[PDB]
Amino acid sequence: QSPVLRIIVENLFYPVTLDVLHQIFSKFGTVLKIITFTKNNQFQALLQYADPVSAQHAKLSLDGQNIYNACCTLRIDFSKLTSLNVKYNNDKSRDYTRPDLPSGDS
Amino acid sequence: VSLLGAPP
């Protein structure tokens, strides 16, 4: 059981920020890190909980749900990654346990 | 209908 979730937000008809993902997923556990990126013309993210059960719970409860009315559908699966490596704290990535990270390459 | 309703 991996504590890391792979997320895809489909029907992105309104922007979804990293902070909004933190808000939604924090209802099921302690979110340690999040990284977002765009690949294959799809908005994706990796999110790490401290507890694998929290990840399981969030997947069961949130998969297929729309973040906002009529858009932004969550497609959630488990990642094989055991943890996440975050280098910066900015609009695309965040390590909630490391407040000293720079916002971009030095 | 959705988790957060209308956008911020």
Numbering used by the authors:
A (entry chain A): 180 to 285
B (entry chain C): 498 to 505
Give excerpts from the publication.
The polypyrimidine tract-binding protein (PTB) is an important regulator of alternative splicing. PTB-regulated splicing of α-tropomyosin is enhanced by Raver1, a protein with four PTB-Raver1 interacting motifs (PRIs) that bind to the helical face of the second RNA recognition motif (RRM2) in PTB. By fusing Raver1 PRIs as N-terminal extensions to PTB RRM2, we have now obtained crystal structures of PTB RRM2 complexed with Raver1 PRI3 and PRI4, which are high-affinity and low-affinity motifs, respectively. Strikingly, although our NMR-restrained docking model assumed an extended conformation of the bound peptide, the core peptides of PRI3 and PRI4 in the crystal structures adopt S-shaped conformations that wrap around the peptide-binding surface on RRM2, which is formed by the α1 and α2 helices as well as the β1-α1 and α2-β4 loops.
The first chimeric construct (PRI3-RRM2) was therefore designed to contain the 12-residue PRI3 sequence (PGVSLLGAPPKD—the conserved core residues, which we number 1-7, are underlined) followed by residues 156-285 of PTB RRM2. The PRI3 sequence used in the chimera contains a Glu to Ala mutation at position 5 in the core sequence, a carryover from the previous NMR analysis, but this substitution does not affect binding (Rideau et al., 2006). PRI3-RRM2 and PRI4-RRM2 crystals diffracted X-rays to 1.4 Å and 1.55 Å, respectively. High-affinity binding by Raver1 PRI3 involves shape-matched apolar contacts complemented by specific hydrogen bonds, a new variant of an established mode of peptide-RRM interaction. In PRI3 (core sequence: SLLGAPP), Leu 2 and Leu 3 both project in the same direction into the binding pocket on PTB RRM2 because of a pinched backbone conformation that is stabilized by an internal hydrogen bond from the side-chain hydroxyl of Ser 1 to the backbone amide of Gly 4. In this conformation, the peptide is able to make four hydrogen bonds to PTB RRM2. For PRI3, the four-residue sequence 3LGAP6 wraps around Tyr 247, whereas in PRI4 a different backbone conformation means that just three residues, 3LGL5, are in contact with the tyrosine. Pro 6 of PRI3, which is conserved in the other high affinity motif, PRI1, makes apolar contacts with Tyr 247 and Tyr 193 that are likely to contribute significantly to binding affinity. This was confirmed by mutagenesis: although conservative mutations of Pro 6 to Ala or Val—both of which retain the apolar character of the side chain—only very slightly reduced the affinity of PRI3 for PTB RRM2, substitution by a polar Ser reduced binding 7-fold. The PRI3-RRM2 complex reveals that these interactions include a number of specific hydrogen bonds—mostly between main-chain groups—and the interaction of the Pro-Pro dipeptide at positions 6 and 7 in the motif with the Tyr pocket formed by Tyr 247 and Tyr 193.
